[PDB]
Design a protein around this ligand. Structure first.
Ligand code: AMB
Ligand code: AMB
Ligand code: K
Ligand code: K
Ligand code: K
Ligand code: K
Ligand code: K
Ligand code: K
Ligand code: MG
Ligand code: MG
Ligand code: MG
Ligand code: MG
Lengths: 368, 368, 368, 368
């Protein structure tokens, strides 16, 4: 049933992602000293100008200058020409900090969860590849292998598919577009070559690369001092690269800067969890699980399972399987997924879904 | 095939929407004097602090102080206590302004379009009601009828559905949550009453309100000097309320602040257009049209039509109907949809899809 | 030997003075917990936007949000229309805070000290009156007596003099100009009347007011929402109203935000001290003491005493009196003047010289 | 009558002076297109962050981005490591711009003027040398002769004097302190040597240098990425280096950013003019002319001439010479001194007094 699909991802230095990371680093910094710290913060950045905003009720002593600069350094902004230097940039902190199982969902909400068997991660090939492509250039940047590579990058992967009496099989990577920031002493010709051999061919399965696959490497020519200015970076503006790459459904809630008490984060994670568990348990090849909550109520106000005619069990057979194996009440979610743990910054770039190192990515047994 | 769904929308004073509007007012201000002005700007705001960023290549003389303050005044921030006064707020302009049919799409892209017959607008009931609810309080604010009403509001509408040998029929509004900023001299009891009688019951069809429908009006109590702070307002962070309320598919591109040359805006509008045309022409009851573009190429690199088994014609019958009635090349899109016109600010709040006053919302004939 | 002279002073809400006070409040906040805290900070403000900058090496835990807002509240900005509300203004903190007798002067320097017997304070009548005029409207503002009075004011006092076989005798207040911010419900006519009866006539000695004295009260008409925007307030820009009102000599060093280790502050205070001591001890009627320091050296590198032919003893008789009664080495100065004490914020408005409540204003005995 | 004196001056890249220059470049930019433009602006800066504030009523089209960046480039900030790059720094413009002989002084005021014959410029040796020292390193920076020299510097010159049956004769330069920002590839030993041979000895007259003169070159060691940060740069904070180096009298008014209608600027220039004219006409060796104005009145409300017993004519003989050769009414001052001319930015660094290229520095004939 042929159709094509494109997804994108951004590197650790893309301005928006710089902000998502700093906001989550501030969340990690509080969890380590107070796992009940209430965090609600966001970051805004513009060329060596970082603004930290937010209301956080906690009881931990934090050096925000330190957690902001350390995060910029980790991302790789240490020199001047790169567009950012953690040692010299303006970190204006305008953050306000106070001090002091069957909970109940804050804010009516509707979270979505998605999983597909086209990849071992149970994520769309398109977004999986987009993320790995960025992940790989960071590796090469940090190992020393490609020392011209700078932090800011963008990746787009378009794959041709075909349905299958149920749903979704990738056939080939139709085209790949990558742009990455770089140092001056490196030719456009040398960058393009390294991008194809060392990053693309080193992450994309042979099965998908072709004699026709189109490559668009550094299409706009040069991106040197293109460091994060990107006309103002912001938190919460990369909602689709943080999730499914345009593939499931998304209600609009951003993750970074919000602690584990916000259903937007927790519940979204819980819904991914059940979606991944279901395909993993052989119960379907592709699922879109929809969980609704009602302001005040703890127990979900209606969960819906949408297989795309890819399950043998039948929605409202699969619904019992979920109601017998999962307790999606907010509090139980944070307890089961170990959501008080400072794992948030790693979550802030390269996607929240797909990587197995996250609790919600470990499939539950599922006794059926 | 019962399921439930929730959508949300925000008023003209919600900080993010304040930013989306100012960005598009700056786009309008340029189009009026140079329809070829190249605009790429964003706004950030935080309590009487508005920052305008961006790169715009144009040849028009614009008073940004004037277009930023006029926009805040239009939204309704003229007094102090409201959280914003266009006469006193800091408008820091950091914008850089330069001077000098078969084009070809910039940036590989994948735009989505959606339409459904559950409402005359051809939009999900859930998001249509969410928007109308906010639209109505603005009317009452502006007429004088509810003079305690301030600009910032948030609305959530959750409707119970049932499929139908094809797709999607709303049955009832299960619950409604609304919070709106307000003046001090007005009781929580008086606000709640006016919200039910004068806004909810004056916009939601009798068929959907019930003796059980749940109302959550000003749940968090008061929201007086609330105003646009939300710790920070940003452009491009309300991507789902600008489109389908979590209903079609969304690849991630924001609209406000980008001119008509960006496929993220134009092509998204074009895809809504054909989706709306298709259901209007009786060819399906619900569609998800997917249009792909390839960097450099003008003609779409693959359009996909997904009816949900609600068309009698059959995808790749309906695809010919689209290829015989539409020319989705970028340049033809801006020409046919009159995209050089300064209509953008009206597009910046209450949704981009649904309102008939926009070119992309006038269904094309469709000769089949 | 007739001549005329004018001086000015500003109220606690003048933007520059708001900054001088916040910077010194931050200095007080550190001294109370670490009398060796090394403070070097400055503040910038612009309508409900306060930026705290600086490098301070100390070991005290301080809530800068708290010391900034408390200082704005103390000044009297609690409501919206006033141009500032400590509860709602943006306090962006960009401060960096580290942790860990015969000292020796940092930076070559030349401090000046001045005293005159025309007033009991040993300060020029012109600046003394200018300050008292502002001090009095604050009293009336804070008592309740003139409840329309807002924080920001400016005062200028011009007095006609006559020399006297030595130096300087005030004869009459030639003209007085005062502008003070105010609430809307108060007539220009009522403000002008209260300014003459209740503030001017209540602070200026009858001996100096005349049937000709000129009054310029609220000359520019109304100053209501004239709250601190004053197109950006700053620290260190009110160097002459902080000292002698244009009367001694001033080398350029600002006081606020600098701890007691900076010769600019300490030594200036020490020089005022000896100047006041000398006239107090009957040794001259008017003095300009000049103390020089050499980078690295502790003992002053040359002190000069300039009486204006008003001493009977003779410069270099008076120099021995000073060398026998004072040890102006930096460290001894901070020890004798109790300069580790958090008295700095009170120093930040209404002048550093004149008020007896400050150590440097208590005249030393002087054994001659 | 021996005494010693010290003065200081700062280079074009000292943060405060960066701000004084940008403010005056904005004033120049308006005068060139509207000599009646009413300018009242100030600049604030902090590491690649420049904020332009102010109210200017004018009728000229100005590209503030352009006049701010051109000014930073002129100063010499083009590379990254220098602490500033006009191509990458944040220039946030928050300026508001409107449109539409016997005038009469605005604001009661008291301006001071000073001149002395110890140098051909008729300025204190101490401040003349301090300025020339900075001027010289800029020359060498700009010529290529000392290519390690960066824009930010500070200079202090302390000279030993002796009175003379009238007033003030310099005897020798006691000590000189200079610190200048620099590039990494240059030794402290090489910088110190070049500062003594090529800048100090190339500007200070042999008569004043000695075998004992003390040199303090780059005392704090290195100052590489120093650049303009000083935690913050502001306009109007270098009031004494802009005038007499602590030598005449100063009432407190800053110059930069204020147009020629403000008596603070104009009248201060007028008072320097007569002071310079008087000593030039042989009528005294040292003068302190004091001109007072009354709000509303055009003709000066009392001018006082203080020779220090160095004139043969006698104050109130010299007063007639001034009243017969000068018309210090505000409007006549701007007309005679050609104050509508865009010469202000050159006035913004290296002192307002002393350089003959300025109208107020050309001595008037003086018919006695
Ligand atoms: C207490 O109500 C506050 C805020 C509201 N949710 C909004 O800003 O949209
Ligand atoms: C270590 O030197 C630094 C700074 C120098 N005094 C200046 O900024 O003027
Ligand atoms: K967010
Ligand atoms: K977004
Ligand atoms: K955007
Ligand atoms: K200062
Ligand atoms: K000053
Ligand atoms: K100024
Ligand atoms: Mg709520
Ligand atoms: Mg809000
Ligand atoms: Mg030093
Ligand atoms: Mg400096």
């Amino acid at each position: 049933g042929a159709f094509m699909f494109t997804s994108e991802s951004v590197g650790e230095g893309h301005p928006d992602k710089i902000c998502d990371q700093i906001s989550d680093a501030v969340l990690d910094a509080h969890l380590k000293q107070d796992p009940n710290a209430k965090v609600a913060c966001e970051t805004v950045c513009k060329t060596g100008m970082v603004l930290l905003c937010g209301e956080i009720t906690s009881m931990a002593m934090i050096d925000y200058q330190r957690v902001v600069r350390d995060t910029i350094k980790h991302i790789g902004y240490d020199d001047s020409a790169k567009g950012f230097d953690f040692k010299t940039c303006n970190v204006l902190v305008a953050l306000e900090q106070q001090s002091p199982e069957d909970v109940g969902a804050g804010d009516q909400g509707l979270m979505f969860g998605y999983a597909t068997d086209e990849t071992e991660e149970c994520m769309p090939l398109t977004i999986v590849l987009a993320h790995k492509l960025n992940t790989r250039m960071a590796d090469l940047r940090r190992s020393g292998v490609l020392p011209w590579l700078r932090p800011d990058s963008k990746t787009q992967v378009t794959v041709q598919y075909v349905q299958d009496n149920g749903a979704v099989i990738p056939v080939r990577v139709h085209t790949i577009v990558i742009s990455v920031q770089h140092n001056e002493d490196i030719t456009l010709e040398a960058m393009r070559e390294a991008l194809k051999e060392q990053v693309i061919k080193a992450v994309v399965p042979a099965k998908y690369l072709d004699e026709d696959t189109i490559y668009h490497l550094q299409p706009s020519g040069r991106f040197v001092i293109g460091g994060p200015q990107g006309d103002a970076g912001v938190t919460g503006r990369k909602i689709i690269v943080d999730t499914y790459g345009g593939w499931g459904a998304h209600g609009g809630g951003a993750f970074s800067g919000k602690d584990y008490t916000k259903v937007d984060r927790s519940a979204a994670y819980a819904a991914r969890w059940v979606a991944k568990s279901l395909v993993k348990a052989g119960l379907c090849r592709r699922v879109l699980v929809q969980v609704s909550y009602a302001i005040g109520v703890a127990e979900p106000l209606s969960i819906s399972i949408f297989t795309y005619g890819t399950s043998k069990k039948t929605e409202r057979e699969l619904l019992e399987v979920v109601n017998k194996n999962f307790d999606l009440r907010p509090g139980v979610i944070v307890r089961d997924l170990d959501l008080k743990k400072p794992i948030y910054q790693k979550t802030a770039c390269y996607g929240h879904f797909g990587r197995s190192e996250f609790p919600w990515e470990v499939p539950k047994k599922l006794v059926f």
